[PDB]
Write a protein that binds this ligand. Structure first.
Ligand SMILES: C[S@@+](CC[C@H](N)C(=O)[O-])C[C@H]1O[C@@H](n2cnc3c(N)ncnc32)[C@H](O)[C@@H]1O
Ligand SMILES: O=C(c1ccccc1)c1ccc(O)c(O)c1[N+](=O)[O-]
Ligand SMILES: [Mg+2]
Length: 214
């Protein structure tokens, strides 16, 4: 049966230019603005995400929550040669859509999709995926997981001094426990970026929280 995510992918395949990431983004944003809302980070917050990627030039980025691959396309198109994005997605239907989206955009060789729940996969990164530490983490999964995954990332030794966490939706729907943690901790230097919830003019924001060590 047909789904929102299939409709988004078909719209991209119909209208965007193969191998052109910006065209893929614009197609998604046009479809979601004109026809059907979706939980992509969107262009307004996406421009802030772009600025963070450019500033920090991360070699290894971890995304929590891929969905249809919008944010993965956004980040991966700005990664330097040899840099990599790992993106965790627990829903196999969405992981499949994301793979096709990346393939269409021509970014598949810069991204690895990890199928599973972040709480299960994060502790396997050092053993199974050869990870030392992460340069950046984009949190955009179910909001109740931001805090426990942040703690787990620290416990597992995946954060180093200067690792950038970038969290979506800290205003709407809101991530109160995660914000209280990073804003209460001397291990994080934080900046708030006020913006808009995807495809609307309701205010939302991203939190940049840079790990300083224990
Ligand atoms: C808001 S959508 C991600 C949007 C995407 N970052 C973008 O901007 O294009 C949230 C996604 O997180 C996934 N998800 C929720 N909890 C997860 C978890 N614990 N581990 C991995 N994926 C999870 C959901 O299945 C869903 O696809
Ligand atoms: O929680 C929702 C949600 C809640 C209710 C209805 C639709 C979506 C949502 C809304 C905007 C986001 O950017 C986002 O990442 C999420 N999320 O699901 O993770
Ligand atoms: Mg979001």
């Amino acid at each position: 049966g047909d789904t929102k995510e299939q409709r988004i992918l078909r719209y991209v395949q119909q209208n965007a230019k193969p191998g052109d990431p910006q065209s893929v983004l614009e197609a998604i944003d046009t479809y979601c603005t004109q026809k059907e809302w979706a939980m992509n980070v969107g262009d307004a917050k996406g421009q802030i995400m772009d600025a963070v990627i450019r500033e920090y030039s991360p070699s290894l980025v971890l995304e929590l929550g891929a969905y249809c691959g919008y944010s993965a396309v956004r980040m991966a198109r700005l990664l330097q040669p040899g840099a990599r994005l790992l993106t965790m997605e627990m829903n196999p239907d969405y992981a499949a859509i994301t793979q096709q989206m990346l393939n269409f955009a021509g970014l598949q060789d810069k991204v690895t999709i990890l199928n599973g729940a972040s709480q299960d996969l994060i502790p396997q990164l050092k053993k199974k995926y050869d990870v030392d530490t992460l340069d950046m983490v984009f949190l955009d999964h179910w909001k109740d997981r931001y805090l426990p995954d942040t703690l787990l990332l620290e416990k597992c030794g995946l954060l180093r001094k200067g690792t950038v966490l970038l969290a979506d939706n800290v205003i709407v729907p809101g991530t109160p426990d995660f914000l209280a943690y990073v804003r209460g901790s001397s291990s994080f230097e934080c900046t708030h970026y006020s913006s808009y919830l995807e495809y609307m003019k309701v205010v939302d924001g991203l939190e940049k929280a840079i790990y300083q060590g224990p």
